[PDB]
Amino acid sequence: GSSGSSGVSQRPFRDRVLHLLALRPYRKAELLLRLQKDGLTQADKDALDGLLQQVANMSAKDGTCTLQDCMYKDVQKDWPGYSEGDQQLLKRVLVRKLSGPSSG
C-alpha cells in the first residue's frame, strides 16, 4: 500500500522471511519454495541460511526454523503477504510473543 497496487517483491528480503516465520515455524526447504514463488536467486538462497539462524532458531531434530520473540517487534500488520486468515492468525501469535508474563 504505497504506490498503486501492493507487492511483496518491492519489500526487502529480511522482511519477506521475517513475516513468513512470524506466522508459523517454517523449514529451510519449505521457506525456500515459498520465497522462490515470488523470486529467489543464489544470493538469496545461501543468504537465507545465514539469515534464518539469525532471525530464527533451527532445531537439530525436527528441521524447522522458528522466529524469535524480540524479532516479532519488527513485524507489521499491513504486510501484502497476509490477507485475512493469516492476519488474524498473527494476532494471537503477537500476543503470546509480545507482551507476556513478568520474566519468561
Curated annotation (Swiss-Prot):
Belongs to the ELL/occludin family. Component of the super elongation complex (SEC), at least composed of EAF1, EAF2, CDK9, MLLT3/AF9, AFF (AFF1 or AFF4), the P-TEFb complex and ELL (ELL, ELL2 or ELL3). Component of the little elongation complex (LEC), at least composed of ELL (ELL, ELL2 or ELL3), ZC3H8, ICE1 and ICE2. Interacts with AFF4; the interaction is direct. Interacts with EAF1 and EAF2. Interacts with ICE1 (via N-terminus domain). Interacts with ICE2. Interacts with USPL1. It is found in: Nucleus; Nucleus speckle; Nucleus, Cajal body. It is linked to A chromosomal aberration involving ELL is found in acute leukemias. Translocation t(11;19)(q23;p13.1) with KMT2A/MLL1. The result is a rogue activator protein. Expressed in all tissues tested. Highest levels found in placenta, skeletal muscle, testis and peripheral blood leukocytes. It comes from Homo sapiens. This is RNA polymerase II elongation factor ELL. Elongation factor component of the super elongation complex (SEC), a complex required to increase the catalytic rate of RNA polymerase II transcription by suppressing transient pausing by the polymerase at multiple sites along the DNA. Elongation factor component of the little elongation complex (LEC), a complex required to regulate small nuclear RNA (snRNA) gene transcription by RNA polymerase II and III. Specifically required for stimulating the elongation step of RNA polymerase II- and III-dependent snRNA gene transcription.
